[PDB]
């Protein structure tokens, strides 16, 4: 596999968004789907997280109260599509479903799940598919106030995961391709968080914060 990957350099990734006061997995799903749609059509179109939060309750999601990227991919599949950010703007509160087929700009036929706990299988998925939806243990001030560098938090769990984000690459700092490795992750806390909205998380350090425990990607 490549020693480094960065899907942003290829045009697969939209700018960093802000979920604001809503606990909305929706941004991780829309990011993985923006990725696949691009691989497929050559166009980068920002998708609607609000569409996911308002309409995916039948699939088992709970809007601002939480959910699962995989259930979001399921909603897209059952719904036959998902609207653009532009046509169904984000308001960060639970509202009535207002999906419009005429405005759908993406689709998936279901999704794929990355082998649990496997960092090599996740590296494979990011090298061959594009940006991947993952869950992580984000509940520590070290991460909440992360600013730069390779994130490592000794108390990070690889089991109790509370935050859905997006892996858009991997790489290594310094000279050794196998030294100081990291996962390149896009957050949804706006550009002012971390390093322009992005965080590097320790890679191949025993599934740090659980990035490889519950990864998935939509099939388009």
């Amino acid at each position: 596999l490549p020693k480094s990957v960065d899907w942003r350099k290829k045009g697969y990734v939209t700018p960093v968004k802000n979920q604001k006061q809503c606990g909305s997995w929706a941004f991780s799903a829309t990011g993985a789907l923006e990725g696949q749609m691009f691989r497929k059509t050559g166009k980068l179109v920002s998708l609607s997280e609000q569409n996911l939060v308002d309409c995916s309750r039948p699939q088992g999601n709970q809007g601002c109260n939480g959910g699962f990227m995989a259930r979001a991919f399921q909603y897209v599949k059952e719904n036959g599509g998902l609207d653009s950010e532009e046509s169904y703007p984000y308001v960060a509160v639970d509202e009535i479903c207002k999906y419009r087929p005429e405005n759908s700009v993406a689709q998936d036929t279901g999704f794929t799940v990355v082998a649990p706990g496997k960092e090599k299988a996740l590296m494979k998925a990011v090298a061959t598919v594009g940006p991947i939806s993952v869950a992580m243990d984000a509940g520590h001030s070290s991460f909440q106030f992360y600013k730069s560098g390779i994130y490592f938090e000794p108390d990070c769990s690889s089991k109790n995961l509370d935050h859905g984000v997006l892996v858009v690459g991997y790489g290594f700092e310094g000279a050794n391709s196998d030294n100081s490795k990291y996962w390149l992750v896009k957050n949804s806390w706006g550009p002012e968080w971390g390093s322009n909205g992005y965080v590097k998380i320790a890679k191949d350090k025993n599934n740090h914060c659980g990035i490889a425990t519950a990864a998935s990607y939509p099939n388009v």
Binding site: G23, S24, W25, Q62, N65, G67, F68, G139, H163, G164
Partner: peptide, 19 residues
């Protein structure tokens, strides 16, 4: 404790949520 808003029909909504 940290207190997460949930519901009796859906006691574990998944990742994210409100506190």
């Amino acid at each position: 404790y940290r207190l997460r808003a949930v519901t009796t029909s859906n006691p574990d909504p998944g990742v994210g949520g409100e506190y």
